[PDB]
Amino acid sequence: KPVSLSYRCPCRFFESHVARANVKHLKILNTPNCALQIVARLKNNNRQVCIDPKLKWIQEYLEKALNK
């Protein structure tokens, strides 16, 4: 068992290799015990993946979604 003690982060791993056009659904999770993490559901895979906030299109997404 990989120990974490606490729950820590809902999203542990990030796909990062997720493009805007392959995203069915976007949810932004705010985890105080970790950092920010975005959840996207894949259109082709149909699964939800956790996205890394360092993605450029994500940065674009942030300024759009949080400001407007």
Curated annotation (Swiss-Prot):
Effect of residue 7 to A: Impaired CXCR4 activation ability, but only slightly impaired binding to the receptor
Effect of residue 36 to C: Formation of an intermolecular disulfide bond, leading to a locked dimer. No effect on CXCR4 activation, but loss of chemotactic activity
Disulfide bonds: 9-34, 11-50
Impact reported for residue 17 to A: No effect on anti-HIV-1 and chemotactic activities
Effect of residue 27 to E: Impaired CXCR4 activation. Loss of integrin activation
Phenotype for residue 27 to A: Impaired CXCR4 activation
Site (Important for integrin interaction and activation): 24, 27, 43
Effect caused by changing residue 49 to A: Impaired CXCR4 activation
Effect of residue 16 to A: No effect on anti-HIV-1 and chemotactic activities
Result, substituting residue 41 to Q: Slightly impaired CXCR4 activation and clear resistance to inhibition by heparin
Residues bound to heparin: 20-30, 41, 48, 64
Effect of residue 25 to R: No effect on CXCR4 activation. Impaired dimer formation, leading to increased chemotactic activity. Eliminates the pH dependence of dimerization
Effect of residue 60 to A: No effect on CXCR4 activation
Mutation effect (residue 1 to R): Abolished CXCR4 activation ability, but only slightly impaired binding to the receptor
Effect noted on mutating residue 24 to E: Loss of integrin activation
Site, Important for dimer formation: residue positions: 25
Mutagenesis or variant effect for residue 7 to H: No significant effect on CXCR4 binding or activation
Span of the annotated motif Receptor activation motif: 1-2
Region (Receptor and heparin binding): 8-12
Protein name as catalogued: SDF-1-alpha(3-67)
